[PDB]
Write a protein that binds this ligand. Structure first.
Ligand SMILES: CCCCCCCCCCCCCCCCCC(=O)OC[C@H](CO[C@@H]1O[C@H](CO[C@H]2O[C@H](CO)[C@H](O)[C@H](O)[C@H]2O)[C@H](O)[C@H](O)[C@H]1O)OC(=O)CCCCCCCCCCCCCCCCC
Ligand code: CLA
Ligand code: CLA
Ligand code: CLA
Ligand code: CLA
Ligand code: CLA
Ligand SMILES: CCCCCCCCCCCCCCCCCC(=O)OC[C@H](CO[C@@H]1O[C@H](CO)[C@H](O)[C@H](O)[C@H]1O)OC(=O)CCCCCCCCCCCCCCCCC
Ligand code: HEC
Ligand SMILES: CC1=C(/C=C/C(C)=C/C=C/C(C)=C/C=C/C=C(C)/C=C/C=C(C)/C=C/C2=C(C)CCCC2(C)C)C(C)(C)CCC1
Ligand SMILES: CC1=C(/C=C/C(C)=C/C=C/C(C)=C/C=C/C=C(C)/C=C/C=C(C)/C=C/C2=C(C)CCCC2(C)C)C(C)(C)CCC1
Ligand SMILES: CC1=C(/C=C/C(C)=C/C=C/C(C)=C/C=C/C=C(C)/C=C/C=C(C)/C=C/C2=C(C)CCCC2(C)C)C(C)(C)CCC1
Ligand code: OEX
Ligand SMILES: [Cl-]
Ligand SMILES: [Cl-]
Lengths: 27, 37, 244, 30, 442, 33, 137, 334, 97
C-alpha cells in the first residue's frame, strides 16, 4: 500500500529522535 | 512505467519524492524534543 | 542575389516593393494569341495627401500633406490577376486576389487623425489601344472598390453596430432619439476609387515592370457617422508578368 | 473650465508639498 | 547569540559542521532528482505526449538525446530509469558524508588540516575555493559539449523531418555570434540570450564558458583580490552568501523567461507549446480551416479594417492577425516553411500547407499553456473535463517565485552583512547615537 | 464637454471655505507666540 | 434523478435497433473521451472547428449518419467530412491514423463502443449544455 | 580635498535635507523624467491605439477626460514587448499614437522606484541603523513590477499592463478576473488577508497605544502635547495595554514584548503583499485561480451549480465583452 | 431613410431560408450532404438570379445535383448585401459558439 510504505518511512524520522532522547544522546 | 523486474516497488516510488519534505518536518520534531534551544 | 527572412526582419524592407535597376528600359512584347497574368503586383505608397475644407464660396480646397502615424504597414503586395488582350489592342488587368488593402491613419495639421482603407480591391485597370508592347511610356488607368473601413460586426465604444450591437444609446434611456439617428444607425459605404500606374522601367528578359502610381479614394466615414475626406496617394509599384 | 480646475488643484497640492518639506515646523529635541 | 529560528547562523564559524550541512543538503537535491525521475517514469505512458503528463525531469533528459527518436517519439525508457537510479543511489553517499561531518566529524576543520580549513576573512583562501569550483563548473559545461559532439548528440527540434537526435559537428566558435547574444536587447524580437535558436550556438557557448570558467578558476587560485576589490566588498561569510543569493535570483528570472519563450532547448514536442506558439497556432488553424472552405485569406478584411487572417507588423512583415499580432516574433519548426523574405508567404500559404502542419497547429492550439491551479486546462471560464497544466507554466511560475524570494534573501543578508561588518546589526548604541551628533536638518 | 456649470462654484467653495478656516486659525496661533 | 437504463439506451444503427449501456460502460466511455477526445471536444463542441459539434441532431444530419453506435464507431476508425465526401484520417484521430495519433493505439473495439455510447447519452442528461458552448456553462 | 572625493562626500552627506546617495544619482533623473512625461501626458496626450486595432482610446483631460477617467494609455498591441523609445518613431506624432509615453514612464519609474528601495538601505547604513526597511518596501515594489512588467512579459504585450489611470486600473482588474479568476487564487486571498489584516492591526495598535497614554495634559489641550520629541521615557503604559487586550481575548493572545509586536506589525502585511505580488506574477504565466466549474453533479449527471458557477457566469460576461473588436478567433489565449 | 440594412434583410426570405447570395457558409450544415463540398461551391459561384441557377454550377456530379434538387426548397436568393458579403464574412462572420 502507498499509505503503508509512507508510514514506515514517516516513522523512521521521529524514531531516530526517540531512541536518542531515551538514551540521553547528543540532541 | 518502471521495468517489470522493479514493478514490485511502484507504491514505494509513488512516495519517494515526498521524502525531502520530511527532513524539514523532522527538524521541527528535533527542536520540540530539545525544547527550541 | 536575394535576401532571407532573417536578413529583412526589423529593417522595414518588408514594407518596400522590389525595385528595378535604372538600366531596365526595355520593352515586353505582347502576343495577342498567348494569355498573360500578373503574378505579383506590389504598391508601396510614399505620400498621403488630404483635401481640406475651405468654408467660403468658390475657393475650392487644396491637397495638403499629412504625417503617417501607423508605421510601415502600408504596402499592398502579392496581388495577382488576369492580364487580358482586348479586340482593340488594349490590355486590361483584372485583380483576382492578393493583400489588396491596408488600413492607414495619417494626421493633418491641427491634430486630426484621418483613417482610410488604402486599397485596390477589385481593381480593373486598362491601357491604351494598340499596345503590343509594354514600354517605359505605358500607362494603366483603372478604378477599384473601396469598402467600408470597418466591417459589419465592428462595435462602437457604446456597443452599437451594424451586424451586431445595440441599436440605441442605452446610456440615455429617455433621450430624444431623432438627434442620435446618424450615430445609432450604422451603414456600410462602398465607394469607387481611381488609379493611374505609369510604367517607367521594364526588364524585357524577366517580365518585370516598375513605375509610379497615383490613386484617389475616400477616407473612413465611421459607418456613416461623419463625412469622408478626399484622399490622394502617391507611390511606386512593381509587377511581374507571366505567360499564363 | 473643468480641465483648468483639475490642473489648478493638482498644482496647489504640489506647492503644498514644497512648503511642508522645506518650511515645516522643525522637530527640536525636548 | 542566535535563537532556534536563526539556528543555522550558529554554523558560520563552525567549518566542519557547516560542511556537513552543505553536503547533506546536496544529497537532498540529488535524492529529489533521483526520486522524481523514478516517479515520473513509474507514471509515464508513451502513447501520450509528455506535456499531457506532468513531466519536467524526463523532458530535460530527452532533450539531451536519451530515450527519444525522430519527432520526439519515446523509443527506450531505460536511460530514464538509469538517470534516476544513479542519482538516487548517489544521494545516500552524499547523505552519509553529510551527516558524518554535521554530527560526528571534527566540528571545525582548521585545526585538523590547513587545506580544508578556512576563515571567511582570508581573501586568498576564499578565492582559491572559488577557483576550484569554477574549474568544476567549466568541466560541467564541457560535459554538455562532449555529449553533443562525441556521445550521441542532442535533440534538435529544428532538424528537418520533424525533429531528431543529431550530433553537433560544427559548434559556433565565432565570438561575434556567441557574445553577440549577450549584447542583444532583452526586448521584443531580440530576447537577449533567450533567442538562441540552434544547437550549434548552444554548444559553442558552452565551449566558451567552459574555457572561460577554467581560465578564471585558474586565475583565482593564483591571485589575491586587488585593492579596489578589497575596498569595494564586505569580506564575511554572510556577505558571500548574499552575493550568491543575488546571482541565483538573477539566474532564476532568466530561467523563467527561458522556459516561457524558448522552444529550442525546451523543445515544444516535450514541454508543450509556448504561449506565443499556441496563439500563433490558433490563427494558423482557422486560416487553414477557412481557406479550405474557399476564403481568400490574404484579401479578407476583418472588422477593424485590419486583415482577419494576415496583416503587417510595424516593420512590414506579413504576420498573423487578430490579437496574436503581438506574437509575430515567434519562430517554430512547423511555421518557418511558410516564411518568405517578407514574412508569411501567401503563395506557400495557399499551396504548401502540409497535413502534419495542420495537425501540429491544432495540437498546439488545444494545449496552450493556460490552466487552473487544480489543473483544469484552458481559459479560466472553461468547464471541468481536461486535466492539464503546461510544464512551461509550472516551470515559469515556480522559478519566478524562487527568484523573487532569493532577491529578498539577497537584500536581507546584504543589508545585515553591511551592518554587522560596521557594528550596528544589533541596534543603536544609546550612548553613541550617530544622529544625536549630527547637526539638525533645519 | 457638457458638464454641470455649477460644478465649478461647487468646487471653488469646497476648496475655499474650509481652507480659509484653517488659514485663519493658524495665523492667529502664530501671533499668540 | 438517476442514470436509469432508459437514459442509457441509445440507437445501435440506422435500422432502429438499440442497445442499453451499463453504467460501467458509460463511465468508462466518459474517461476514454477525456483521454482521447476532450482536448478538442470538451462539452460536445469542437474547439478547432466550432461549426461542427457532437449534438445528436448534428450527427443525424451527417452523411453516413453518426447518431448511432455503428456510425460513431466507424467514424473513429475512418472519419469523413460531414457530407461523407472525403476521408480525414490524416488530421483527425482514428484507428486508421494511430501512427500519427498515438493515443488511439491502445483502444480496443469495446473502448470505441464506450466512447460512442457516452457521446450519445450525454445530451440526454445535459441537453442544451452538451455542444452549446460557453453560453450554457 | 580631491575634486572627486568632494563630490562623493556631498553625494553621501547625511547633512543634505533630502539624502541623495549613489542610488539617488539614478533615482532623481529617472523619477523626474517619468513624472514630467506623466503630468504632460495626463493633461494633453492624444488618443492611443492600445489594442493595435486602430481604435484609439482617449486618456487625457484635454481630449474629454476627467480625473477619474483619465489615463496614460498602454502602448499598442502591435508593438508587443518591443522597445519603443522616441528615436524609434518617424515622428513624435507617431510615437504618441502608438502609446510611447507609457513605455517611457513605466521604465523610468521602475528604475527610479528600484533605486528608491536601494536609497533606503543606503541611508540606513550612513545613519547607523538596521537595514531592513527596504525589505518592507520590496512588497509594494514587487507589486508594481507585477502589473507593469511581469504580467506584460508573460502575456506578450505592454498593452495588457495596468493603465496609469483610475478607471484604467479598474479595467485592468476586471479583465484580469475574467482571464485568470484571480478571486479564486489563494495568493490573492492571502493579499486580501495581508491588507485587511494590516488595516485591522493598524487600528488595533493605534487604539491600544492611544488607550494607554499616560496623563500628561489637561482636558483643554491635545494629549499629543504630552509627548516631546526625543524624550527617553515611553509615553504609554504597555503593561496597562497588555492587561486590557489579554482580558479582551485571553492573556497569551496579547503581546507584552514591544519588539515582537512591532515585528509582527511589519511581517503580516509585508508577507501577504509579497504573495499577492507573486499571484499577479504567476498568473502572468497562466497558472490561474481554482476552477470548480461543473464540479458538482447529481446521480444522473446534471450539473448542480455552486457559487463558483455563478462567478463563472460573471467572468463570462467580462470575457465576451472586453476588447470587443480585437478577437477574430474563438479563444483568447493571451 | 437611415435604416440598418441587416435588420431590414431579416424581414426577407433571408430571414427564413438559406440565401444563396448572402448567408454565411455554416448555415449549409443544417441539411444533409451540403457541407463542406457543395457549400464551398455555392458560395464561390454566387451571385445567382434564381435558386435554380445553382444546378448549372460547372462540375456537379449527378449525385450533387440530386442533393441540390432535394434541397432547392430550403434555398432562396435576394439582392447581394454588401454588409454581409464584404470582409470574407460569408466564410467567417466572427460567430463561433
Ligand atoms: C546587475 C544588475 C542588473 C541591472 C541591469 C538591468 C538592465 C536591463 C533591464 C531588464 C529589463 C527586462 C525586460 C524583459 C522584456 C522581455 O521581452 O523579457 C523577456 C526576454 C525574452 O524575450 C523574448 O524573447 C523571445 C525569444 O524567442 C525567439 O526565439 C526562440 C528560440 O527557440 C523561439 O523560436 C521563439 O519563438 C522566438 O520568438 C522573442 O525574442 C520575444 O520577442 C521576446 O519577448 O527575456 C530576457 O531577455 C531574459 C531576461 C529576463 C529578465 C527580466 C525579468 C525581470 C525580473 C523583474 C524582477 C522583479 C522585481 C523584484 C522587485 C523587488
Ligand atoms: C537542509 C536542512 C538543514 C540542515 C542540513 C541543517 C544542519 C544542521 N543544523 Mg540546522 N535547522 C534547519 C535545517 C537544517 N539544518 C531548520 C529548518 C531549522 C529550524 C527548525 C534548523 C535549526 C537549527 C538549530 C536550532 C541548530 C541547527 C544546527 C545544525 C547543525 C548541527 C545539528 C546537530 O547537532 O543536531 C543533532 C541532531 C540529532 C542528533 C538528531 C538526528 C539528526 C540526523 C542527522 C537525522 C538524519 C536522518 C537520515 C534519514 C539519516 C540517513 C543516514 C544515511 C545517509 C547513512 C547541522 C549542521 C545546530 C547548530 O548550529 O549547532 C551549532 C543548532 O543549534 N539547526
Ligand atoms: C520547484 C519545482 C517543481 C515544479 C515546477 C513541480 C511541478 C510539478 N510537479 Mg513536482 N515536486 C516538486 C517540485 C516541483 N514540482 C518537489 C520538490 C516535490 C517533492 C514534494 C514534488 C513532488 C511531486 C509529486 C509527487 C507530483 C508532482 C507533480 C507535479 C505537477 C503538478 C503539480 C501540482 O498540481 O501542484 C499543485 C500545487 C500546489 C501543491 C501548490 C503549492 C504552493 C506552495 C505550498 C507555495 C510555495 C511558497 C514558497 C516556495 C507539475 C508538473 C504531480 C504530477 O503530475 O506528477 C507526474 C505529482 O503527483 N511533483
Ligand atoms: C565537498 C565535499 C566534501 C569535503 C570538502 C570533504 C572534506 C573532508 N572530509 Mg568528507 N566526505 C564527503 C564530502 C566532503 N568531504 C563525502 C561525500 C563523504 C562520504 C562519501 C565524506 C566522508 C568523510 C569521512 C568518513 C571522513 C572525511 C574526512 C574529511 C577531511 C579529510 C579529507 C581527506 O583526507 O581525504 C583526501 C581526499 C580523498 C581521499 C579523496 C579521494 C578522491 C575522491 C574520492 C574522488 C573525487 C570525487 C568526484 C570529484 C565527484 C564524485 C563522483 C560523482 C559525480 C559520481 C576533509 C575535511 C575525514 C575527517 O574529518 O577526519 C576525521 C574522515 O574521516 N570525509
Ligand atoms: C553561465 C552561462 C550559461 C548559460 C547562458 C547556459 C545556458 C543554457 N544551458 Mg548551460 N551550463 C553552464 C552555464 C550556462 N548555461 C555551466 C557552467 C554548466 C555546467 C554546470 C552547464 C551545463 C549545462 C547542461 C548539462 C545543460 C545546459 C543547458 C543549457 C540551456 C538550457 C538551460 C537554461 O535555460 O539555463 C539558462 C541559463 C542560466 C539561468 C544561466 C545564466 C547565467 C548568467 C547569464 C550570468 C550570471 C553571472 C553570475 C552572477 C556570476 C557573476 C560573477 C561576477 C564576478 C561578475 C541554456 C541554453 C541544457 C542544454 O543546453 O540542453 C541542450 C542542458 O541540458 N547547460
Ligand atoms: C562565480 C564566478 C565568479 C566570481 C564570483 C568572481 C569573483 C571575483 N572576481 Mg573573478 N572571474 C571569473 C568568475 C568569477 N569571479 C571568471 C570565470 C573569470 C575569467 C574571465 C574571472 C576573471 C576575473 C578577473 C580578471 C578579475 C576578477 C576579479 C574578481 C573579484 C572582483 C569581482 C568584481 O569586482 O566584480 C564586480 C564587477 C564589476 C565592478 C564590473 C563588471 C562589469 C560587467 C561586465 C557589467 C555587466 C552588467 C550587466 C547588468 C550584466 C549583463 C551581462 C552583460 C555582459 C551584457 C572577485 C573576487 C578581479 C580581482 O580582484 O582579481 C584578482 C579581477 O581583476 N575575476
Ligand atoms: C459653505 C458651503 C459651501 C461650501 C461647500 C462647497 C459646496 C459643496 C458642494 C457640495 C454640493 C455638491 C452638489 C453638486 C450638484 C450641483 O452642482 O448641482 C446643483 C444641485 C441642484 O440641481 C440643479 O437643479 C436645477 C433645477 O433645480 C437643474 O436640475 C440643474 O441641472 C441641476 O444641477 O444642487 C442640489 O441639488 C443641492 C442639494 C443638497 C441636498 C443634498 C443632501 C442630501 C444628501 C445627504 C448627503 C449626506 C452625506 C454627508 C457625507 C457623509
Ligand atoms: C476522440 C477519439 C474523438 C472523437 C470520438 C471525435 N473526435 Fe473529433 N473533430 C475535430 C475536427 C476539426 C472535426 C471536424 C472534421 C471535419 O468535418 O472537417 C471533428 C469532428 C468530429 C466528429 C463529427 C461531428 C459531426 O457533427 O459530424 C466526431 C463524431 C468526432 N470528431 C469525434 C477535431 C478533433 C480533435 C482536435 C485535434 C481531436 C483530438 C478530436 N476531434 C477527437 C475526437
Ligand atoms: C530512498 C529509500 C530509502 C530512504 C529513506 C529515508 C531517507 C527516509 C527518511 C525519512 C525521514 C527523514 C522521515 C522523517 C519524517 C518526519 C516526520 C514524521 C515529521 C513530522 C512532524 C510533525 C508531525 C510536526 C509536528 C510539530 C512539532 C513536532 C513541533 C512544532 C509544531 C508541529 C505541530 C509542527 C529507504 C531506506 C527507505 C529504502 C528505500 C529507498
Ligand atoms: C544534518 C541534519 C539534518 C539533515 C539531514 C540530511 C538532509 C540528511 C541527508 C540524508 C540523505 C540525503 C539520505 C539519503 C538516503 C538515500 C538512500 C538510503 C537511498 C537508498 C536507495 C535504495 C535502497 C535504492 C533502491 C532501489 C533501486 C536500486 C532500484 C529502484 C528501486 C529502488 C528505489 C528500491 C536535519 C535537518 C534533519 C537535522 C539536523 C542535522
Ligand atoms: C553558454 C551559452 C551561451 C553563452 C554564454 C556566455 C558566453 C555567457 C556570458 C555571461 C557573462 C560574461 C556574464 C557577465 C555578468 C556579470 C555580472 C553579473 C556583473 C556583476 C556586477 C555587479 C554585481 C557589480 C556590483 C558592484 C558595483 C556595480 C559597484 C561596486 C560595488 C559592486 C561590486 C557591488 C550562449 C548565450 C551563446 C548560448 C547558450 C549557451
Ligand atoms: O489585450 Mn488586453 O486582453 Ca489579455 O486576452 Mn487577449 O489579450 Mn486582450 O484579449 Mn483578453
Ligand atoms: Cl476592455
Ligand atoms: Cl484573435
Amino acid at each position: 500500500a502507498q499509505l503503508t510504505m509512507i508510514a514506515m518511512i514517516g516513522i523512521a524520522g521521529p524514531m531516530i529522535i526517540f531512541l536518542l532522547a531515551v538514551r540521553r544522546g547528543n540532541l | 512505467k518502471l521495468p517489470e523486474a522493479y514493478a514490485i516497488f511502484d507504491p514505494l516510488v509513488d512516495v519517494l519524492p515526498v521524502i525531502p519534505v520530511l527532513f524539514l518536518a523532522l527538524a521541527f520534531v528535533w527542536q520540540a524534543a530539545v525544547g527550541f534551544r | 542575389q536575394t535576401l532571407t527572412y532573417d536578413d529583412i526582419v526589423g529593417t522595414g524592407l518588408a514594407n518596400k516593393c522590389p525595385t528595378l535597376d535604372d538600366t531596365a528600359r526595355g520593352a515586353y512584347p505582347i502576343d495577342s494569341s498567348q494569355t498573360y497574368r500578373i503574378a505579383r503586383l506590389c504598391l508601396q505608397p510614399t505620400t498621403f495627401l488630404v483635401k481640406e475644407e475651405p468654408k467660403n464660396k468658390r475657393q475650392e480646397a487644396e491637397f495638403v500633406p499629412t504625417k503617417l502615424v501607423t508605421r510601415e504597414t502600408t504596402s499592398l503586395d502579392q496581388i495577382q490577376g488576369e492580364l487580358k488582350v482586348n479586340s482593340d489592342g488594349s490590355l486590361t488587368f483584372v485583380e483576382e486576389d492578393g493583400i489588396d488593402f491596408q488600413p492607414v491613419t495619417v494626421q493633418m495639421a491641427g491634430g486630426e487623425r484621418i483613417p482610410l482603407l488604402f486599397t485596390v480591391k477589385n481593381l480593373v485597370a486598362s491601357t491604351q489601344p494598340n499596345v503590343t508592347s509594354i514600354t517605359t511610356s505605358t500607362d494603366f488607368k483603372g478604378e477599384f472598390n473601396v469598402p467600408s473601413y470597418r466591417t459589419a460586426n465592428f462595435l462602437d465604444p457604446k456597443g452599437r453596430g451594424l451586424a451586431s450591437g445595440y441599436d440605441s444609446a442605452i446610456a440615455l434611456p429617455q433621450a430624444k432619439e431623432e438627434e442620435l439617428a446618424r450615430a445609432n444607425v450604422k451603414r456600410f459605404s462602398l465607394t469607387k476609387g481611381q488609379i493611374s500606374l505609369n510604367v517607367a522601367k521594364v526588364d524585357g528578359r524577366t517580365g518585370e515592370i516598375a513605375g509610379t502610381f497615383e490613386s484617389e479614394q475616400l477616407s473612413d466615414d465611421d459607418m456613416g457617422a461623419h463625412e469622408p475626406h478626399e484622399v490622394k496617394i502617391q507611390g511606386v509599384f512593381y509587377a511581374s508578368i507571366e505567360p499564363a | 473650465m473643468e480641465t483648468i480646475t483639475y490642473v489648478f488643484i493638482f498644482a496647489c497640492i504640489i506647492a503644498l508639498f514644497f512648503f511642508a518639506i522645506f518650511f515645516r515646523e522643525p522637530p527640536r529635541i525636548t | 547569540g542566535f535563537a532556534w529560528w536563526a539556528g543555522n547562523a550558529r554554523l558560520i564559524n563552525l567549518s566542519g559542521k557547516l560542511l556537513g550541512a552543505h553536503v547533506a543538503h546536496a544529497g537532498l537535491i540529488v535524492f529529489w532528482a533521483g526520486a522524481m525521475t523514478l516517479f515520473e517514469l513509474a507514471h509515464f505512458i508513451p502513447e501520450k505526449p509528455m506535456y499531457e503528463q506532468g513531466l519536467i525531469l524526463i523532458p530535460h533528459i530527452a532533450t539531451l538525446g536519451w530515450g527519444v527518436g525522430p519527432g520526439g517519439e519515446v523509443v527506450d525508457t531505460f536511460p530514464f530509469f538509469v538517470v534516476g537510479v544513479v542519482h538516487l543511489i548517489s544521494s545516500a553517499v552524499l547523505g552519509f558524508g553529510g551527516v558524518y561531518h554535521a554530527i560526528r566529524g571534527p566540528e571545525t576543520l582548521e585545526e585538523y588540516s590547513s587545506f580544508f580549513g578556512y576563515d571567511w576573512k582570508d581573501k586568498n583562501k576564499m578565492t582559491t575555493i572559488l577557483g576550484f569550483h569554477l574549474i568544476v563548473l567549466g568541466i560541467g559545461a564541457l560535459l554538455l559539449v562532449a555529449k553533443a559532439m562525441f556521445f550521441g548528440g542532442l535533440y534538435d527540434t529544428w532538424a528537418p523531418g520533424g525533429g531528431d537526435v543529431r550530433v553537433i559537428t560544427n559548434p559556433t566558435l565565432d565570438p561575434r555570434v556567441i557574445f553577440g547574444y549577450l549584447l542583444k536587447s532583452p526586448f521584443g524580437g531580440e530576447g537577449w540570450i533567450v533567442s538562441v535558436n540552434n544547437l550549434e550556438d548552444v554548444v559553442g557557448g558552452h565551449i566558451w564558458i567552459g574555457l572561460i570558467c577554467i581560465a578564471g578558476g585558474i586565475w583565482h587560485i593564483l591571485t589575491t583580490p586587488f585593492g579596489w576589490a578589497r575596498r569595494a566588498f564586505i569580506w564575511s561569510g554572510e556577505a558571500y552568501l548574499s552575493y550568491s543569493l543575488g546571482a541565483l535570483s538573477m539566474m532564476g528570472f532568466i530561467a523563467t523567461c527561458f522556459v516561457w519563450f524558448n522552444n529550442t532547448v525546451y523543445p515544444s514536442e516535450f514541454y508543450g507549446p509556448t504561449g506565443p506558439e499556441a496563439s500563433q497556432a490558433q490563427a494558423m488553424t482557422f486560416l487553414i480551416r477557412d481557406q479550405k472552405l474557399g476564403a481568400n485569406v490574404g484579401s479578407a478584411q476583418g472588422p477593424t479594417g485590419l486583415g482577419k487572417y494576415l496583416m503587417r507588423s510595424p516593420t512590414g512583415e506579413i504576420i498573423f492577425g487578430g490579437e496574436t499580432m503581438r506574437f509575430w516574433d515567434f519562430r517554430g519548426p512547423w511555421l518557418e516553411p511558410l516564411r518568405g523574405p517578407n514574412g508569411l508567404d501567401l503563395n506557400k500559404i495557399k499551396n504548401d500547407i502540409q497535413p502534419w502542419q495542420e495537425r501540429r497547429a491544432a495540437e498546439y492550439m488545444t494545449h496552450a499553456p493556460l490552466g487552473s491551479l487544480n489543473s483544469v486546462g484552458g481559459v479560466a471560464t472553461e468547464i471541468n473535463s481536461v486535466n492539464f497544466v503546461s510544464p512551461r507554466s509550472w516551470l515559469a511560475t515556480s522559478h519566478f517565485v524562487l527568484a523573487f524570494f532569493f532577491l529578498v534573501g539577497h537584500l536581507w543578508h546584504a543589508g545585515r552583512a553591511r551592518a554587522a561588518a560596521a557594528g550596528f546589526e544589533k541596534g543603536i548604541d544609546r550612548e553613541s547615537e550617530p544622529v544625536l551628533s549630527m547637526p539638525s536638518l533645519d | 464637454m457638457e458638464v454641470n456649470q455649477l460644478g465649478l462654484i461647487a468646487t471653488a467653495l469646497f476648496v475655499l471655505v474650509p481652507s480659509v478656516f484653517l488659514i485663519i486659525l493658524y495665523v492667529q496661533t502664530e501671533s499668540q507666540q | 434523478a438517476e442514470l436509469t437504463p432508459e437514459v442509457l439506451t441509445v440507437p445501435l444503427n440506422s435500422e432502429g435497433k438499440t442497445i442499453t449501456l451499463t453504467e460501467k460502460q458509460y463511465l468508462e466511455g466518459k474517461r476514454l473521451f477525456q483521454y482521447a477526445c476532450a482536448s478538442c471536444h470538451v462539452g460536445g463542441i469542437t474547439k478547432t472547428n466550432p461549426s461542427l459539434d457532437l449534438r445528436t441532431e448534428t450527427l443525424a444530419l451527417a452523411t453516413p449518419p453518426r447518431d448511432n453506435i455503428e456510425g460513431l464507431v466507424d467514424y473513429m476508425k475512418n472519419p469523413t467530412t460531414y457530407d461523407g465526401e472525403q476521408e480525414i484520417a490524416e488530421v483527425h484521430p482514428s484507428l486508421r491514423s494511430a501512427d500519427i495519433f498515438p493515443k488511439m493505439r491502445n483502444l480496443t473495439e469495446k473502448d470505441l463502443v464506450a466512447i460512442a455510447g457516452h457521446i450519445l447519452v450525454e445530451p440526454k442528461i445535459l441537453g442544451d449544455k452538451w455542444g452549446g458552448g460557453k453560453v450554457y456553462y | 580635498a580631491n575634486l572627486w572625493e568632494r563630490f562623493c562626500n556631498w553625494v553621501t552627506s547625511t547633512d543634505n535635507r533630502l539624502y541623495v546617495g549613489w542610488f539617488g544619482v539614478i533615482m532623481i533623473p529617472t523619477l523626474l523624467a517619468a513624472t514630467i512625461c506623466f503630468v504632460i501626458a495626463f493633461i494633453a496626450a492624444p488618443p492611443v491605439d492600445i489594442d493595435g486595432i486602430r481604435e484609439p482610446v482617449s486618456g487625457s483631460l484635454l481630449y474629454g477626460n476627467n480625473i477619474i477617467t483619465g489615463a496614460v494609455v498602454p502602448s499598442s498591441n502591435a508593438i508587443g514587448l518591443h522597445f519603443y523609445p522616441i528615436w524609434e518613431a518617424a515622428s513624435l506624432d507617431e510615437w504618441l499614437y502608438n502609446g510611447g509615453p507609457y513605455q517611457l514612464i513605466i521604465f523610468h519609474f521602475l528604475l527610479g522606484a528600484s533605486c528608491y528601495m536601494g536609497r533606503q538601505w543606503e541611508l540606513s547604513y550612513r545613519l547607523g541603523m538596521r537595514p531592513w526597511i527596504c525589505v518592507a518596501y520590496s512588497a509594494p515594489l514587487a507589486s508594481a513590477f507585477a502589473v507593469f512588467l511581469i504580467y506584460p512579459i508573460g502575456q506578450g504585450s505592454f498593452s495588457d499592463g495596468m493603465p496609469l489611470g483610475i478607471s484604467g486600473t479598474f479595467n485592468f482588474m476586471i479583465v484580469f478576473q475574467a482571464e485568470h479568476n484571480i478571486l479564486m487564487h489563494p495568493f490573492h486571498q492571502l493579499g486580501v488577508a495581508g491588507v485587511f489584516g494590516g488595516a485591522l492591526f493598524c487600528a488595533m495598535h493605534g487604539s491600544l497605544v492611544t488607550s494607554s497614554l499616560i496623563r500628561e495634559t489637561t482636558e483643554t489641550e491635545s494629549a499629543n502635547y504630552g509627548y516631546k520629541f526625543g524624550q527617553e521615557e515611553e509615553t504609554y503604559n504597555i503593561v496597562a495595554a497588555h492587561g486590557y487586550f489579554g482580558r479582551l481575548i485571553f492573556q497569551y493572545a496579547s503581546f507584552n514584548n514591544s519588539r515582537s509586536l512591532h515585528f509582527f506589525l511589519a511581517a503580516w502585511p509585508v508577507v501577504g503583499v509579497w504573495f499577492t505580488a507573486l499571484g499577479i506574477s504567476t498568473m502572468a504565466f497562466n497558472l490561474n485561480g481554482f476552477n470548480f466549474n461543473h464540479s458538482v453533479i447529481d446521480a444522473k449527471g446534471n450539473v448542480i451549480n455552486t457559487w463558483a458557477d455563478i462567478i463563472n457566469r460573471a467572468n463570462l460576461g467580462m470575457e465576451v465583452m472586453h476588447e470587443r473588436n480585437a478577437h477574430n478567433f474563438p479563444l483568447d489565449l493571451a | 431613410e437611415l435604416v440598418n440594412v441587416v435588420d431590414e434583410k431579416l424581414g426577407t426570405a433571408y430571414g427564413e431560408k438559406i440565401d444563396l447570395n448572402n448567408t454565411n457558409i455554416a448555415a449549409f450544415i443544417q441539411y444533409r450532404g451540403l457541407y463542406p463540398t457543395l457549400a464551398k461551391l455555392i458560395v464561390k459561384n454566387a451571385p445567382y438570379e434564381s435558386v435554380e441557377d445553382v444546378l448549372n454550377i460547372p462540375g456537379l456530379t449527378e449525385r450533387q445535383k440530386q442533393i441540390l434538387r432535394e434541397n432547392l426548397e430550403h434555398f432562396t436568393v435576394t439582392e447581394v448585401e454588401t454588409a454581409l458579403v464584404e470582409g470574407g464574412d460569408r466564410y467567417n462572420n466572427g460567430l463561433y459558439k
